[PDB]
């Protein structure tokens, strides 16, 4: 009910309740370039979620543990006392390590599930 | 065939969903047409995704049916109606239904997030 980015200045534990509002707002040569680049950004994000095994979800839990070197904070100060913009700035240039770990964890999970489903 | 089941009853037309699928994706006017088809396909796929129905053609949900939307029984709905007549009958409530579906998913993931946190 807050609207697009209305929760942007709210805390992470409150802004996380409005993910569908943000998701629904993501979708002559210049106009086609703008539409194609919007489609490409959406598809790259969806493919990246699929690689992690999070396709079809907005809140996706994973098997990658949190490193204290990425952000040495407790859940209360992360979720109740700061916004997603401040968090995004705080963990800048740590996201590529997290993405690589998520990719490797999903590859291992897919192999383990295939082997479990291969037992008679 | 494509739209062949449009005149069939919904109980029979629901078994041809893969026939109706695949026909949604396949000088500037042709490029605009391709981009428009892709945009509509992605809008529909995102709309399914925010309902927890991604990757499925028949998706069951947790939203109960309100008798004010339609008071027909299942035999009349599925054996004596086509999808076009049904779509016409409940168009005035479609967006309301969509909103409720979205809300259910908003709750569902949170519950799953808690269940996996034990």
């Amino acid at each position, epitope marked *: 009910s807050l609207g697009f980015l209305g929760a942007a200045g709210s805390t992470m534990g409150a802004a996380s309740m409005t993910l569908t509002v943000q998701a629904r707002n993501l979708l002559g040569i210049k106009q086609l370039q703008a539409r194609v680049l919007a489609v490409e950004h959406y598809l790259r994000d969806q493919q990246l979620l699929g690689i992690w095994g999070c396709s079809g979800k907005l809140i996706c839990c994973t098997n990658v543990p949190w490193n204290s070197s990425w952000s040495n904070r*407790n859940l209360s100060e992360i979720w109740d006392n700061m916004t997603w913009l401040q968090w995004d700035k705080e963990i800048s240039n740590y996201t590529q390590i997290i993405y690589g770990l998520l990719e490797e964890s999903q590859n291992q999970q897919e192999k383990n599930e295939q082997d479990l489903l291969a037992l008679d | 065939g494509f739209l062949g089941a449009a005149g069939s009853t919904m109980g029979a037309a629901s078994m041809t969903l893969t026939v109706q699928a695949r026909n949604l994706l396949s000088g500037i006017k042709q490029l605009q047409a391709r981009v428009l088809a892709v945009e509509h396909y992605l809008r529909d796929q995102q709309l399914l995704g925010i309902w927890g129905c991604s990757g499925k053609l028949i998706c069951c949900t947790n939203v109960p049916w309100n008798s004010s939307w339609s008071n027909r029984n299942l035999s009349e709905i599925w054996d004596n109606m086509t999808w076009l007549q049904w779509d016409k009958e409940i168009s005035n409530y479609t967006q309301i239904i969509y909103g409720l579906l979205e809300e259910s998913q908003n709750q569902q993931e949170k519950n799953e997030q808690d*269940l996996l*946190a*034990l």
Partner: antibody
Amino acid sequence: VQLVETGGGLVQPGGSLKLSCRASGYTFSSFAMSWVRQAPGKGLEWVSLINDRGGLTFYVDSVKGRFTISRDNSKNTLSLQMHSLRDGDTAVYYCATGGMSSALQSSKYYFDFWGQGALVTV
Amino acid sequence: ALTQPPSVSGSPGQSVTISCTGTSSDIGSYNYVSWYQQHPGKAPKLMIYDVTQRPSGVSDRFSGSKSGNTASLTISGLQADDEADYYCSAYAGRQTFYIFGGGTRLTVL
């Protein structure tokens, strides 16, 4: 922080009470709630747990099919509806905070604050 | 569910240990053991949570620990106000979330 149970007292076997608990002095919607029982001459035993949003309910197997736990966050009210009370259900039922957290808080696998308790005689 | 002695005693100025014994699937695996103090006729007060962590409102004379599948509450001082039934509780995972022992009657002589 206060918890006051306002449920009923003496009931015959097979009847119902529908106990309730009123909370005050803290944010009700931020804490999970639970019901824990003590037989008059025995120790204290957990009965049921509901999360902070009311969507998830858990019970001990001995009451899983006859007790329903629910909450109303707009009235600061916790309810427990017992629809098949047995003679073994005679106990003091305590309303308590805690028991789980909804993933975005720290763990609360303990009972943070207890009410005074309603007496169920059956 | 949990094994706990029915009673313990000691003199003012000394300390006592109240043990609580479970199995490998509950105390040993989750490390979520709480202790609380119940007076007859009164509601229990939380005294220890998360095995070793003391909440606010409780002095340092109450502490706890675990070893293997056994949890332990250490109580020093042993004043008249501590004559109460102490109970241990442990998280067993989902599907029977919490398991409890019997009561330990602490007698202050």
